[PDB]
RNA sequence: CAUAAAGACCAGGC
DNA sequence: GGCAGTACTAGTAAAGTACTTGAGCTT
DNA sequence: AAGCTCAAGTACTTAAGCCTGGTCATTACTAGTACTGCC
């Protein structure tokens, strides 16, 4: 049929309920156990819904097919099939309407905010209880405590009466029709901004976001009350027995039978037609009946005998109160599926799978029944259902003719990224295991000791052919995460190919190629009789490749034959051998990138098959078996062991003699063993590359197969050091290895580190889909739909250097992203009007780094499209190497590329524990090479002491040559003296910086005069004497040594000019008021003229740090779920000058003085926080202050929109880049908008200031009024950063946020607004069961085929349509 | 009965007996669990009890958990360790004098280990009475120091008390990392009785004690003269009277032949005593599910050759020729129960 | 051989060289001198492939001692019919390299084999021997689960396994975001509708595949019906709206 | 072609 | 022959987020 | 006296796949009724 545009959710009306429903259900009449025919006109009826049998009547008058259309005369019942009983509906006329508890027990009360009653209190007072018939009137201004009084002015206490305000909900409609809404609603926009009492504006700003939902295109408030109860479908609740005398029925059979027996009781017992003040007893029973259909558990559950479990309500099937939400997303059982063991198919290719042959007898049978009638196996369709359903030995031939061109769906259950479900052709293989391709085994985090996978069967020819060009594994060779291929030649294939291009060593080991040139023939010809060349060293004497293996087979040559045959085996089945030269050991994953970029994908398939065969086949031809004698012990091992064991005796004698202390021996015992593994390590890796090069254990770790630089050292030499389960290091090193006699003690020590890795994956192998789930729930509506937008608003500046991992890294963040404008940084390269950059362009953006500070790039987080993201701002990453195509769910492939590398991360606990590091500094900066000094964010000035003194910390002191390359990375603290400035050339081995690692001098930046401020003898200052200077000077007392009353007094050397006014710092509006800490050195008089750079005070001691950076999956849960870190850094609320307050060992202070207030802006700093701020130039707002993380909520408030979108996508990469996984910036940014999708505007343009609405609608509102025409409006905002557990909790859709346990507050929000749910997302399209938009479902994907016969065929009616 | 049956079937602490192996049986009874009733820690915590403590030296083998959903939660119990009387584990230590090692053993408490220094099992000893070199490395309670022979008070019994019976059968445990010694101890936990049982070509000294000490090998009650031998029974004619070929105080022995265990396997007991063999109290009479004569024989010995064959042995795959299925060398017996419980009907 | 550098388990190569040199270390002792006691045909060929390499005086010889002696100098190690090895105090590389230069046939562990496929003179003599391997049991997980047409539940329309009919694979949520992560629009659509849930899809599909043509395009699913009737009976209402 | 429920808890593979 | 007792059988007793809210401090 | 914001107090949260195994019990207490024994 047609493509459905969108669905619309609204409240049910009886003028609409009686449209799809016919008849009237009056009694609880079900189908008896004997006959299936309907009994009476109840829930199961033939006049209402339909008959049961084919053509028979209820009475039994006419049963023959003679009367098929005409009804009977005495009892006219039209008869059809029993299918029409399912679709047709009936409605139950309830005499009194009832409430919907989703609109009641929910905290945003829909009848408490709009209609000003208590939101929780009066609902637990009126509804179930006995308070009786407020609307309107003229008795009581007070509107809260209902009985007695209650709207608008008469009379409170004693007796009064026994005002609607009724129990239940038959007249809450009458509250919603009058409370007087006009005295509750034009007047809302005046009471907020006009009246100065903010109690009236903080009570009335909450109650418009539900008030204006009914004023707009949504419905009226008078339909929240359930009047008419629609029935449940008849065949949806069958009543068949289970076995013998037991039953398995739904829990709705006990609940629809009660509501109908509590309906006519109010009609005719109760024949009145009374005032409503009389009756109580029925709606206390009927409302009790319908509440079990609404919700059980929020006040009172509904239980059965010997069952302390609530009855399974209609909401409890969705939200899962009993724990069946963990069963709904556990999966729906596939009718065409199987499971068996997995194994390896080498000769199997990337197009095919090898599955067992008995499973195909069962799972493939509906395709067999349509094949048996053409052949001589079976005759009809009925007799074929009792032969092919079992073990049959004839169907073996006729099964394979269907599976010529019908691939299936392979399925491994850790379906993390895109390639968790792949498509392959079935090959019928004997045995019980499925065959898995070895290149595929990098996409499947698995091994072959017990892993078991699943399989599925594609049914229609529509879904069959998309399992060949879109789902097949060798089509999508690239990762969703980055541009690197996941599928890669891993271990056995690279062993023979790695050994193939090698050269043995007796004397000489160069590389040689002679197919082609002529000089190396005569050059390497005469060596066969000499010592330079043999039968395995530098020889080749022949023209071409062909007879070189002829000469090599007859024992004359050994080497450069595998290099000669490798150069023609792989490029014979594929042209373009100009790229087919770099195999290597680290270029094994790079060939599947550049061979896809230069050549096509059909090159890549057979290109992987040739390398597959010549890789896995010749590894047995080499036969690289590891033995015990292959692990060559270095000769330098026992000498370093003998030197390390002879020093602990001397150091122990030093401790016994008593001339030394414990501290200077304890660090020596660990020093002589901490450097021994470095000296013995730098003795097997250089021994086997010069003597044997053909060693098995050396080549299987030197190559990319499976090797690390730490697991080989544990066997070969000595495993160095093992730590405690806390993290503190063990003072006793271990010296025996896996090769020698390893005692019980060192094996017992190794278990302390062996328990972390396997106990890490203990509870991490019960469960694998919530780090995926909580990140795909938020960004599910991210679909590529691009119509030539090209936006410029919200342009993002990218810093040339990232925020920082430890103290000062050097990395770049741009990959495959479009450019914003014309930027000419290189001398040869140039980026034009917006173009998708390559992987080569990040090296051009990283090369000229001393000229660029902001890379102009269009971002994902700022785009005009409300639901989706355009093709330009997103990039290239779809499945493959070219541009993104239309219709891609770029939000789920982004989040699942974050869920997959989190498996290898260290999981200790979700909220930060600790680590261990050491802070050190040296005042010895000596440049190694030549070049110039590059300085950034510094204000150098020459003082009166003749020293070029800086005024800033975090100064980038790097050696930048004439080509602009980072060669050094040094740290310059505050108060340093540079020998040369910015731009001056230096020489090799020259000191360019020198300071004191004892003093951080308080150094000024402006000139003028020094005025004594808040310094009184006996309160803050006291005449003391230093220990190094010797000059008696005025010394400020500490914070704890001060007298009573001087706790608020802060001393200051206030800098004034000659006129007495305040001297502002150049750049900002900050007065120069530097505070003097306690125990400072003030060698300066009063009123004397100073200069910019003069030392005011000094800091005698330095401390701080020792507890720092988290790392791991706990930081992933810390950054995606925006929470409080373990190490908070008090970020500066105002941007300006910074200067230390105190320096005492107890507490350190920090004060900023913006314009007027100086002293109340104090920030306390403990000794754990490492001080990263200086006493000089202004800092930005939101800048870091300590060695710790930041809060994403406050840095959102302070710095701006270029901060949280670049701090949350960079710091999460500081975790994954440590383990080695490279995740692109494109796949983190689509969830940053979804945490930013709601905010709060400050200027009312269309709605009020506190709304909390979405921002993609507000971007159009500021777009059309400011950009095009008609009175531009400054509709600015204030952003709101949330967590992913709350940003997905309140969405636009109602089934997108129904993946939580809070389905009460969402369905009412999508219910009262009348919100048309345009199903853009794909998550919101599987639960509803409709057609996927991203594939063939988008409206651009509409076309039809045409051949030449059906091209000349419609030419005849259009000539026929011409008249004579 | 309503409180003791609830622990017997529905409890966290009590699970099904793993009977695919007598070694799996003996590692199942001697098992620790960190999870019990609700009055203790939960499944979600445990990161201070999974990690082994340095006092646990020769008292629990720290690598004896199964590999799967729970690592470090089980941690089964070592060889010479034993709950003595009141819950206090007391592992044996050889009481050694000044220079002569006395063959007696003593059960030392965990708080009493900190009061004496104990020597090690990797030291060379001639028979029981001499000491090779005056400086030998020793451990007091976790720290390392060099002591002389006059200071040594206690000594370890052997290098076997540090491991469990799943790891004492592991030959080269000093050469393997613990990360795969855990699974190497769990391969014996998931074994199966094969047809052609073959004892390992490397012996340890524990393959013969599991069959005798557990309920695996039939042990006679009193020695006599064997008169007849069958597969289902072994009749023993014990001469309680004057010696005659006329029969005597017969103790018939029923050998459980072919029944179903918990792990869908079979427990077999094949006789070995021939006609006319006087048995001793303690002599073997029949075999076990995998035992050859009295020793444990889980798997087999086949010709191995380390080579990447062609692709197939990619991660953890095992390749084998056509001969392995032509003979019934790994053909095991799998027994499945089809149980169905009787009820009533409406008619 | 690549399971050795990553998974640090060199002791299986210790057992491989050991089971290779079982003819020449300590099964050297009980294999022949005790006995070929049951078989009188091995006491002619095995008696000369034994003394050609291995000549340690700790390890006792055939030519001095008869059959009845070892059946007195090796009654002490009869329980060790092959070699004996304790856990952490066992073999040593100074003893292994001393007892493997002995052991017939090779020297230092490695020997030139021949390929079973190519045949030729095999480069780099390899570590071979007799490893004591172990077969794991066959739990019912390893039994093949084959389901095409079984029963369905009452309150839901999901399949069900059990005694006769086998269990069906559930289609979990990460499996939904894989085909959802793909451009395949109809496979995931029929996966939750025609496979599992719809009573109108599994019947019409099975009636059209047996004809030879395609199955009818999916209309209403059963999740849309059941969830929709869960919505309609409450105060809210969901209604499908056309173009 | 129709029947073997649902749920709880435990064990197991990775 | 009638009444009462009793047995059988069918209904039936870690560690965080947001969010609230009470209280302390100013026009 | 109104009121305005701020901080502690509080309730509530969701617990990283799927897969089979076996098992185990679907409730034991109260009320009415019918049967049987005794007076
Ligand atoms: Mg596995
Ligand atoms: Zn009729
Ligand atoms: Zn855009």
From Swiss-Prot, chain A:
UniProt binding sites for Mg(2+): 447, 449, 451
Matches recorded under InterPro entries: DNA-dir_RpoC_beta_prime, DNA-dir_RpoC_beta_prime_bact, RNA_pol_asu, RNA_pol_N, RNA_pol_Rpb1_1, RNA_pol_Rpb1_3, RNA_pol_Rpb1_3_sf, RNA_pol_Rpb1_4
Name of a matching Pfam family: RNA_pol_Rpb1_1
Domain of life: Bacteria
Location of N6-acetyllysine modifications: 958
Uses, biotech or industry: Co-administration of salinamide and rifampicin or salinamide and myxopyronin suppresses the emergence of resistance to both antibiotics.
EC number assigned by the record: 2.7.7.6
Result after altering residue 750 to A: Resistant to antibiotics salinamide A and B
Residues the entry annotates as binding Zn(2+) 1: 57, 59, 72, 75
Binding-site list for Zn(2+) 2: 789, 863, 870, 873
Reaction catalysis annotation: RNA(n) + a ribonucleoside 5'-triphosphate = RNA(n+1) + diphosphate
Post-translational modification: Acetylated on several lysine residues in the presence of glucose.
CDD domains: RNAP_beta'_C (cd02655), RNAP_beta'_N (cd01609)
Keyword flag Metal-binding: yes
Cofactor: Mg(2+); Zn(2+)
Biological process terms in GO annotation: bacterial-type flagellum assembly; bacterial-type flagellum-dependent cell motility; cell motility; cellular response to cell envelope stress; DNA-templated transcription initiation; intracellular iron ion homeostasis; nitrate assimilation; regulation of DNA-templated transcription elongation
Effect on the protein upon substituting residue 757 to A/C: Resistant to antibiotics salinamide A and B
Cellular component terms per the entry's GO annotation: cytoplasm; cytosol; cytosolic DNA-directed RNA polymerase complex; membrane; transcription elongation factor complex
Stored SUPFAM superfamilies: beta and beta-prime subunits of DNA dependent RNA-polymerase
Outcome following mutation: residue 754 to T/V: Resistant to antibiotics salinamide A and B
Subunit and partners: The RNAP catalytic core consists of 2 alpha, 1 beta, 1 beta' and 1 omega subunit. When a sigma factor is associated with the core the holoenzyme is formed, which can initiate transcription. The rRNA transcription and antitermination complex (rrnTAC) consists of RNAP, NusA, NusB, NusE (rpsJ), NusG, SubB, ribosomal protein S4, DNA and precursor rRNA; S4 is more flexible than other subunits.
General function of this protein: DNA-dependent RNA polymerase (RNAP) catalyzes the transcription of DNA into RNA using the four ribonucleoside triphosphates as substrates.
Family note: Belongs to the RNA polymerase beta' chain family.
NCBIfam families, per database record: rpoC_TIGR (TIGR02386)
Protein name per UniProt: DNA-directed RNA polymerase subunit beta'
Source organism per UniProt: Escherichia coli (strain K12)
From Swiss-Prot, chain B:
Post-translational modification (record): Acetylated on several lysine residues in the presence of glucose.
Coiled-coil region(s): none
Biotechnology: Co-administration of salinamide and rifampicin or salinamide and myxopyronin suppresses the emergence of resistance to both antibiotics.
UniProt effect for mutating residue 182 to M: Resistant to antibiotics salinamide A and B
Functional summary from the UniProt entry: DNA-dependent RNA polymerase (RNAP) catalyzes the transcription of DNA into RNA using the four ribonucleoside triphosphates as substrates. Resistance to the antibiotics salinamide A, salinamide B, rifampicin, streptolydigin, CBR703, myxopyronin, and lipiarmycin can result from mutations in this protein.
Family: Belongs to the RNA polymerase beta chain family.
Subunit record text: The RNAP catalytic core consists of 2 alpha, 1 beta, 1 beta' and 1 omega subunit. When a sigma factor is associated with the core the holoenzyme is formed, which can initiate transcription. The rRNA transcription and antitermination complex (rrnTAC) consists of RNAP, NusA, NusB, NusE (rpsJ), NusG, SubB, ribosomal protein S4, DNA and precursor rRNA; S4 is more flexible than other subunits. In pull-down experiments interacts with CedA. (Microbial infection) Interacts (via flap domain) with Escherichia phage lambda antitermination protein Q; this interaction renders bacterial RNAP resistant to transcription pausing and allows it to read through termination signals.
Name of the molecule in the record: DNA-directed RNA polymerase subunit beta
